[PDB]
Amino acid sequence: ELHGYQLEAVAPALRGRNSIVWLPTGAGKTRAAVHVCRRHLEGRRGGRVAVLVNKVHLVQQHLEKEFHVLRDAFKVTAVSGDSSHKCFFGQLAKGSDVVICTAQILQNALLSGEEEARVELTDFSLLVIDECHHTQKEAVYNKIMLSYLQKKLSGQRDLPQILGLTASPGTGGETSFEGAVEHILQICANLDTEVIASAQQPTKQYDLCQEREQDPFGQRLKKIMAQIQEHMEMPELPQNFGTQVYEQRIVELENRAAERFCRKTRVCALHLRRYNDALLINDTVRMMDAFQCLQQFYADKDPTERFLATTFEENRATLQALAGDQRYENPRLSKLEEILQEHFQGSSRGIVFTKTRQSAHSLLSWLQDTAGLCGQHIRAAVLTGSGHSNQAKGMTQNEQQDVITLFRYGELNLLFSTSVAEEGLDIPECNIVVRYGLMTNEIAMVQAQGRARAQNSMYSVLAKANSREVYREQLNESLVGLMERAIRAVQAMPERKYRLKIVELQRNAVLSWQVKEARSSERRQLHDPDDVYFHCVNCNVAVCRGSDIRTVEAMHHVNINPNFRFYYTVSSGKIHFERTFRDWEPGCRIVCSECRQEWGMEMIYRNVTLPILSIKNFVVVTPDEKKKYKKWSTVTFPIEEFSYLEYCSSTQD
RNA sequence: GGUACGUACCC
RNA sequence: GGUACGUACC
Ligand SMILES: Nc1ncnc2c1ncn2[C@@H]1O[C@H](COP(=O)(O)OP(=O)(O)O)[C@@H](O)[C@H]1O
Ligand code: ALF
Ligand SMILES: [Mg+2]
Ligand SMILES: [Zn+2]
């Protein structure tokens, strides 16, 4: 059953050594890990395995395709975010021999204050960490492993054996041999690795496209942007319309205008960001997709707003007409059409990877409206993860699974997917991967290519000629080789030198964490919460103090002041999510009573309703400065945990 | 919707 | 120090 190379790769794990199994994409690391799990559980009494993954869909895949075979002798349980609300994790885990979950499910249990929810690392004898190259920086995998290292270095006994699985440790952005080796050693230190274990036809093509000869739609948007910038009456405004740098600079101006309460500048900047978004969409997909971006924004008075509405209305019909003209088609789409026409003339089974969820939806719509493809028997669908925004909702575990199951045997034969499916997904019949204008690291490149499991697969890079994306793809190909050299060098290192380096790196990691925690705490304690005032980002009115805020589940920032209700208005009916939570559900959206700016949403927490505030909708004012924050975790005053008991007691008075 | 982190980009 | 996107958790 197991191939020779699978047996070879797991020999250290079978002996109890912490290891990383480094085998190519599609080589069968999962089955190898199942064998380790079986022998681990057979080889002692009372063992318990946790299998950690990084994407929701991989929980069911690993269970149904691989780990379920253990149920002839052992209890195997799977948990994701979608199923979380039903059982206490600690109960479920402790009743199982093997638990399979996304890593943050385990992390939440490790951090829990509730006896029934909580688990310790010492409740497991083996941790299998899939896609273990993510065990870096402040990713969840590394939060879990840093706690392991803190416990190890303090002398804790009974920590689990570690089995990491990866095709691609990467080079961590390093382009030198010295740097790449250091990166490999860092990953080994993070995972407490004793040995990196390894073993002892697809074609790649660059499908390059040219810039559009004529782009009257884009040209008109740039003309409008210039008009809006003239209206702002400001020198030194950015001119580089239709770029990520422009986006950054205009949002930075928007944030500065919020902090200084310059309403006209802030609103103009907010609109300019939408025109820039439209230019980026126009470059990626169809003109009409870009038009719909702007039309939706203006469909959803003040002199600045009147100017901006009029400006759009004056150009709307010309823009829509241009967007219907085939003469100005996006060459990226012309190229994609050529690829699909060549390869889907039922035979093929493909994934086209795009950056954004909205792009994936737009590509499906394009496909469905393209005469030249209607006739090739293409049955396509979008696959995204559970990310969400106003631009684009996500997909639930169940929705993702439906698409995946139909794609597996060809009920669907083409997916437009985000990076949700770049790693781990196993579709043996997938024989084509197109990467549509992506800028990624070498890991994502190797992984996404690897979704084409079939013999005689093809991998297409569809990107603009002479672009940074093409340069980065070429560089990344070289970095894969560099990575391989570096891993072999680490594998060949004298044991004494390796062990000493690992020691050094683990020590550095645990010391560096302490210093970071101290710095974060110092920042958090700078101001008394009574001295911090929140202002509406839109109208600048004061609305509460820092002392009014509490956290729920260390995430949701509620205002507990009984008179805050006079400052916000309930602005919708009840919100519904797909996922249900243990102690609360959403109520309605809330907005500033003075200007209708979105602020957050109600939480119905047991028998009370509390308003949750989104940090991005405020300017935070302290005695020292006024600042727009993107994250609650960096504010300069302390916030206490919500106490439901204390809250109910104080309200009864 | 809320939160965090990763990747890309700029400083 | 920021921007965008993505995923994950809630
Ligand atoms: N020894 C084997 N014989 C036949 N098929 C195998 C063997 N080991 C694994 N497989 C299959 O190989 C495919 C790729 O395995 P997977 O574990 O997803 O690869 P990866 O190493 O990227 O995790 C799966 O369909 C799996 O069932
Ligand atoms: F390396 Al894989 F699925 F784990 F392609
Ligand atoms: Mg895998
Ligand atoms: Zn307001």
Residue numbers in the entry: 2 to 201, 213 to 312, 317 to 361, 364 to 671
Show the paper's wording.
Homologous double-stranded RNA (dsRNA) dependent ATPases RIG-I, MDA5, and LGP2 (RIG-I-like helicases [RLHs]) are key cytosolic pattern recognition receptors in the vertebrate innate immune response against RNA viruses. RIG-I and MDA5 possess tandem N-terminal caspase activation and recruitment domains (CARDs), a central DECH-box helicase domain (Fairman-Williams et al., 2010), and a C-terminal domain (CTD). LGP2 differs in lacking CARDs and thus independent signaling activity. To gain further insight into the role of LGP2 in the anti-viral response and its co-operative role in MDA5 signaling, we performed structural, biochemical, and cell-based studies on chicken (ch) LGP2 and MDA5.
We present the crystal structure of chLGP2 bound to 5′ mono-phosphate (5′p), 5′ tri-phosphate (5′ppp), and 3′ overhang dsRNA at, respectively, 1.5, 2.2, and 2.0 Å resolution and characterize the RNA binding and ATPase activity of chLGP2 and human (h) LGP2. The unusually high resolution of the structures reveals details of the ADP:AlF4 binding site and the highly hydrated chLGP2-dsRNA interface. ADP:AlF4 is tightly bound at the interface between the chLGP2 Hel1 and Hel2 with conserved motifs Q, I, and II from Hel1 and motifs Va and VI from Hel2 engaged in the interaction. Motif Va (440-EEGLD-444) and motif VI (467-QGRARA-472) directly interact with ADP:AlF4, a characteristic of the closed form. The high-resolution structure reveals the complex hydrogen bonding network involving Asp131 and Glu132 (motif II), AlF4, Mg2+, and water molecules in the presumed transition state. One water molecule coordinated by Glu132 (motif II, DECH) and Gln465 (motif VI) likely represents the attacking nucleophilic water, which catalyzes ATP hydrolysis. Because of the full closure of all domains around the dsRNA, many residues of chLGP2 make direct interactions to the dsRNA. The 3′ end interacts mainly with the turn between strands β16 and β17 (the 571–574 “3′ end-binding loop”), with fully conserved Glu571 hydrogen bonding with both hydroxyls of C1∗ and His574 bridging between the C1∗ and G2 riboses. In chLGP2, the G1 base is imperfectly stacked between His406 and tilted Phe595, whereas the equivalent residues in hLGP2 are aliphatic, Asn408 and Ile597, respectively. The only fully “closed” RIG-I structure in which all motifs are correctly positioned for ATP hydrolysis, is that of the isolated dRIG-I helicase domain bound to dsRNA and ADP:AlF4 (Kowalinski et al., 2011). The closed conformation of the chLGP2-dsRNA-ADP:AlF4 complexes reported here thus closely resembles the latter dRIG-I structure.
